[PDB]
Design a protein around this motif. Structure first.
Motif, mmCIF file in Angstrom:
data_model
loop_
_atom_site.group_PDB
_atom_site.id
_atom_site.type_symbol
_atom_site.label_atom_id
_atom_site.label_comp_id
_atom_site.label_asym_id
_atom_site.label_seq_id
_atom_site.Cartn_x
_atom_site.Cartn_y
_atom_site.Cartn_z
ATOM 1 N N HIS A 15 46.815 40.511 38.749
ATOM 2 C CA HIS A 15 45.592 40.970 39.428
ATOM 3 C C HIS A 15 45.616 42.337 40.010
ATOM 4 C CE1 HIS A 15 44.665 36.923 38.666
ATOM 5 N NE2 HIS A 15 45.493 36.427 39.575
ATOM 6 N N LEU A 16 46.620 43.117 39.651
ATOM 7 C CA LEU A 16 46.743 44.433 40.269
ATOM 8 C C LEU A 16 45.502 45.264 40.179
ATOM 9 C CD1 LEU A 16 48.254 46.830 41.541
ATOM 10 C CD2 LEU A 16 49.371 47.122 39.255
ATOM 11 N N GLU A 17 44.965 45.473 38.964
ATOM 12 C CA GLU A 17 43.788 46.370 38.853
ATOM 13 C C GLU A 17 42.513 45.760 39.441
ATOM 14 O OE1 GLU A 17 44.236 49.582 38.499
ATOM 15 O OE2 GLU A 17 46.283 49.433 37.787
ATOM 16 N N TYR A 18 42.320 44.462 39.247
ATOM 17 C CA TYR A 18 41.121 43.778 39.811
ATOM 18 C C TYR A 18 41.090 43.977 41.373
ATOM 19 C CZ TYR A 18 38.349 39.958 41.672
ATOM 20 O OH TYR A 18 37.452 39.212 42.390
ATOM 21 N N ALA A 19 42.215 43.671 41.992
ATOM 22 C CA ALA A 19 42.330 43.712 43.486
ATOM 23 C C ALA A 19 42.425 45.087 44.070
ATOM 24 C CB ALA A 19 43.468 42.845 43.910
ATOM 25 N N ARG A 20 43.143 45.992 43.398
ATOM 26 C CA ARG A 20 43.165 47.418 43.787
ATOM 27 C C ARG A 20 41.771 47.950 43.967
ATOM 28 N NH1 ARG A 20 47.029 51.165 42.382
ATOM 29 N NH2 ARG A 20 47.460 50.266 40.333
ATOM 30 N N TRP A 45 50.402 56.550 47.927
ATOM 31 C CA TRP A 45 51.480 55.627 48.312
ATOM 32 C C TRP A 45 51.576 54.422 47.378
ATOM 33 C CZ3 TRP A 45 49.523 55.015 54.126
ATOM 34 C CH2 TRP A 45 49.510 56.314 54.751
ATOM 35 N N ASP A 46 50.530 54.197 46.563
ATOM 36 C CA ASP A 46 50.410 53.008 45.676
ATOM 37 C C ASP A 46 50.828 51.668 46.300
ATOM 38 O OD1 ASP A 46 49.377 51.634 43.463
ATOM 39 O OD2 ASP A 46 51.025 52.280 42.051
ATOM 40 N N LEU A 47 50.305 51.390 47.502
ATOM 41 C CA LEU A 47 50.521 50.073 48.127
ATOM 42 C C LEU A 47 50.044 48.872 47.309
ATOM 43 C CD1 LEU A 47 49.932 50.483 51.870
ATOM 44 C CD2 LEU A 47 51.939 51.032 50.500
ATOM 45 N N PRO A 48 48.927 48.998 46.572
ATOM 46 C CA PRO A 48 48.542 47.869 45.693
ATOM 47 C C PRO A 48 49.672 47.404 44.776
ATOM 48 C CG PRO A 48 46.755 49.326 45.937
ATOM 49 C CD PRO A 48 47.889 50.028 46.603
ATOM 50 N N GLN A 49 50.417 48.350 44.233
ATOM 51 C CA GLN A 49 51.498 47.978 43.379
ATOM 52 C C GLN A 49 52.553 47.222 44.104
ATOM 53 O OE1 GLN A 49 53.543 51.333 41.492
ATOM 54 N NE2 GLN A 49 55.256 49.951 41.163
ATOM 55 N N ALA A 50 52.902 47.649 45.326
ATOM 56 C CA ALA A 50 53.877 46.892 46.090
ATOM 57 C C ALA A 50 53.396 45.457 46.306
ATOM 58 C CB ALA A 50 54.119 47.604 47.431
ATOM 59 N N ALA A 51 52.110 45.316 46.687
ATOM 60 C CA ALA A 51 51.600 43.938 46.913
ATOM 61 C C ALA A 51 51.690 43.043 45.665
ATOM 62 C CB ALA A 51 50.197 44.007 47.434
ATOM 63 N N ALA A 52 51.360 43.638 44.521
ATOM 64 C CA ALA A 52 51.424 42.919 43.230
ATOM 65 C C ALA A 52 52.834 42.469 42.864
ATOM 66 C CB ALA A 52 50.830 43.816 42.122
ATOM 67 N N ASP A 61 41.623 36.552 44.622
ATOM 68 C CA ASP A 61 40.923 36.929 45.834
ATOM 69 C C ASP A 61 41.970 37.143 46.978
ATOM 70 O OD1 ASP A 61 38.256 36.734 44.708
ATOM 71 O OD2 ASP A 61 38.276 34.574 45.179
ATOM 72 N N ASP A 62 42.990 36.316 46.974
ATOM 73 C CA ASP A 62 44.091 36.419 47.949
ATOM 74 C C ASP A 62 44.934 37.675 47.726
ATOM 75 O OD1 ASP A 62 43.296 34.054 49.174
ATOM 76 O OD2 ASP A 62 44.846 32.853 48.225
ATOM 77 N N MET A 63 45.007 38.158 46.496
ATOM 78 C CA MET A 63 45.673 39.433 46.244
ATOM 79 C C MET A 63 44.927 40.545 46.939
ATOM 80 S SD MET A 63 48.226 41.222 45.188
ATOM 81 C CE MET A 63 49.009 39.879 44.433
ATOM 82 N N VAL A 64 43.596 40.464 46.941
ATOM 83 C CA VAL A 64 42.810 41.436 47.692
ATOM 84 C C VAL A 64 43.141 41.435 49.250
ATOM 85 C CG1 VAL A 64 40.572 42.363 48.314
ATOM 86 C CG2 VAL A 64 40.879 41.365 46.047
ATOM 87 N N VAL A 65 43.179 40.254 49.839
ATOM 88 C CA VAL A 65 43.480 40.061 51.264
ATOM 89 C C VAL A 65 44.889 40.622 51.532
ATOM 90 C CG1 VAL A 65 43.979 38.249 52.999
ATOM 91 C CG2 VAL A 65 41.975 38.094 51.512
#
Ligand code: CL
Ligand code: CL
Ligand code: CL
Ligand code: CL
Ligand code: CL
Ligand code: CL
Ligand code: CL
Ligand code: CL
Lengths: 308, 308
Positions: A15-20, A45-52, A61-65
């Motif tokens: 879900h990286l791109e959807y949630a980013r 900083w590309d934090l989305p990538q770290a979260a993924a 949806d939880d990836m977004v949160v």
């Protein structure tokens, strides 16, 4: 450049791109960034990538949160005018509002209202959703200990005291400031399980969390150092009066020693489950607990490689 | 005068006079009282007696620490000039320092230094001594939830909003403000055991703590009312438009209904231990856990009878 070869193979969220995309709009909607330049700095900083990489089992949806949450901590310093006289007092004030938010019913308004505290009041309502009182208490203290330690770091700097910690104090302190206990706790929210409480308080698991936090804080110091006195490398050099390179070598050896002790406790998990008399579904929840730790150690590393 | 006949028989500490004497000198040494008149006002509340009835198994030195702690909460309002403009903001500020003290290593100095925060930094070092990380986390969140709720009560009053809570909101809120969860937690410190973590998070025990808190908050409202709008009696009367006496009768019936549900869950504890598969020494630690709840419900009642 220090590389580590870790013995983990670890999934990455689809879900990286959807949630980013949702996450990036959210940082503007919540007024966490205020200018195009601030935003592009945040994006780098590309934090989305770290979260993924650290929460790879999250629903979309939880990836977004999770990304939204991730951003709170990293944006936190940058919410405050850096040249104002009492910066460190305003930070403590805001940090303490972040500390009490998980200690009050979900959906309550913060007393100190600023973009970050409002954002966090929102995020906590989702992050706590469906989780037991046991998990919320554990999360709340982990997050709280992190934020207190963050305030101590901020005061250390504002007082002209960076560079005063010796090696043992620095190592103890860095375990606190790295904020990995609450990071691991959120793995249970992301994937939809809870670790059996008697396993979470067992000496093996408590030590594993502490070593995961050491390992990650020390890798992060090695990585920040290689791109520039409150840093493991600098501390070792002050302490040993050795070369910059001997201090790097030693930071590397400390990190591998934390990792290897972590790996030894990992092999002891089945005996822990036996000593606790866990049934098979409890064992399975433990195993998922251990995987949340691996996701953090491995994912943080692989994210650090691709800069920020 | 509402009396309750409770089905508990509950020990009282033999250390009352030994510890009272040390405790009374301590309140002066820590500068929690500032005048002879303030002191004699403090003494009239007879908090030592409450501590002796609620923590009856404490060693003598630990009875002193418990009385000292007891005093912190009750003296807390009285540390601040009552007529200053921003009283409610100073209270929030101090409460939050009390909240973070258990989230930082024992022996650390408070950031906001005043007599109460220094006193608490001291007390927490003793109260946490010998206790597991699991217990300290649980205590810390219980205490924190209490203090947040206390700040909400303070703001409600400063804003001119007393008398606005309806019955269901008032009951929910009073569960929070009465501060009994952390009070029960300290029973484990006082007597030297810890309740098995899987029992503490079981639905039976979580509900028992909530009902104990209801019961005690409602008895305390009945008792404060009988000696004088933020009070169960007043709320019921607003809600039902009934007589002062019908509102008293109903407060009494609500309290007995919380108590009776508490007593039903008490009889279910052996089945809980079976469903959890606890061994006999674990069962014994559970049983002591339940006794800490009884000490609070019974001891608080018997202390209230002898005024304050
Ligand atoms: Cl995950
Ligand atoms: Cl974070
Ligand atoms: Cl040094
Ligand atoms: Cl689960
Ligand atoms: Cl006791
Ligand atoms: Cl108390
Ligand atoms: Cl009303
Ligand atoms: Cl025990």
């Amino acid at each position: 450049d220090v590389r580590f070869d870790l013995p983990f193979d670890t999934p990455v969220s689809e879900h990286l791109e959807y949630a980013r995309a949702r996450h990036l709009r959210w940082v503007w909607e919540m007024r966490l960034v205020r200018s195009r330049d601030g935003f592009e700095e945040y994006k780098s900083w590309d934090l989305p990538q770290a979260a993924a990489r650290t929460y790879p089992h999250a629903s979309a949806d939880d990836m977004v949160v999770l990304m939204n949450w991730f951003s709170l901590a990293f944006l936190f310093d940058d919410q405050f005018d850096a040249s104002r006289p009492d910066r460190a007092d305003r930070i403590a004030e805001v940090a303490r509002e972040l500390i009490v938010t998980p200690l009050r019913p979900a959906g309550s308004p913060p007393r100190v209202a600023c973009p970050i505290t409002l954002a966090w009041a929102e995020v906590w309502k989702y992050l706590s959703h469906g989780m037991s009182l046991t998990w919320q208490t554990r999360f709340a203290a982990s997050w709280g200990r992190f934020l207190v330690a963050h305030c101590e770091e901020v005061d250390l700097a504002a007082r002209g005291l960076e560079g005063t910690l010796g090696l043992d104090e620095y190592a103890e302190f860095r375990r606190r400031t790295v904020g990995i206990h609450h990071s691991i706790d959120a793995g249970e929210r992301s994937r939809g399980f809870e670790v059996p409480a008697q396993a979470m308080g067992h000496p093996v698991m408590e030590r594993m969390r502490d070593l995961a936090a050491d390992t990650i804080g020390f890798m992060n110091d090695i990585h920040s150092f290689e791109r520039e006195g409150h840093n493991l490398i600098a501390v070792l050099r002050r302490e040993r009066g050795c070369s910059w390179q001997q201090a790097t070598d030693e930071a590397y050896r400390m990190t591998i020693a934390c990792l290897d002790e972590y790996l030894e406790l990992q092999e002891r998990v089945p005996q822990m489950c036996d000593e606790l008399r866990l049934d098979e579904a409890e064992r399975d929840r433990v195993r998922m607990g251990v995987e949340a730790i691996q996701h953090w150690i491995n994912g943080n590393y692989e994210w650090a490689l691709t800069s920020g």
